[PDB]
Amino acid sequence: SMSVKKPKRDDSKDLALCSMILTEMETHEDAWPFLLPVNLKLVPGYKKVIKKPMDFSTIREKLSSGQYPNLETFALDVRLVFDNCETFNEDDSDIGRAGHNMRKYFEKKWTDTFKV
Numbered sequence: 001s002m003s004v005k006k007p008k009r010d011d012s013k014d015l016a017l018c019s020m021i022l023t024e025m026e027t028h029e030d031a032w033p034f035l036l037p038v039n040l041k042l043v044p045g046y047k048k049v050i051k052k053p054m055d056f057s058t059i060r061e062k063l064s065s066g067q068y069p070n071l072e073t074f075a076l077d078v079r080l081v082f083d084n085c086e087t088f089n090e091d092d093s094d095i096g097r098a099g100h101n102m103r104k105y106f107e108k109k110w111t112d113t114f115k116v
């Protein structure tokens, strides 16, 4: 509270670490469904059903232009990619399985990088 400061983790490396994690995501074999925005003009239903589209290139642009206040807002956007994927894709489809795979991949890197 006022004049009662909580000790805080060193956040000075977060930008570099999130960029590294995103690079590993981008280069993953199963990243192809997520590298660019879904084309709202070519993919029926997507614009109406998915209220907040997100993809790796958009995340990369936001990371590069200071649009994430902290590492938690970065993780929200990454998870939003896979949440959208689950909404629109059957689990037993190529894109659906890709999403599950990339989510697992992300969360381990996230834990290993930032949880002690």
Ligand SMILES: Cc1ncccc1N[C@@H](C)c1ccc2c(c1)OCCCO2
Pocket (backbone or CB within 6 Å): 032, 033, 034, 036, 037, 038, 039, 043, 085, 088, 089, 095
């Ligand atoms: C992640 C996601 N969720 C719902 C719909 C599409 C997508 N991914 C988009 C990028 C995509 C993937 C596969 C596609 C495609 C486009 O069209 C062009 C070629 C055919 O195959």
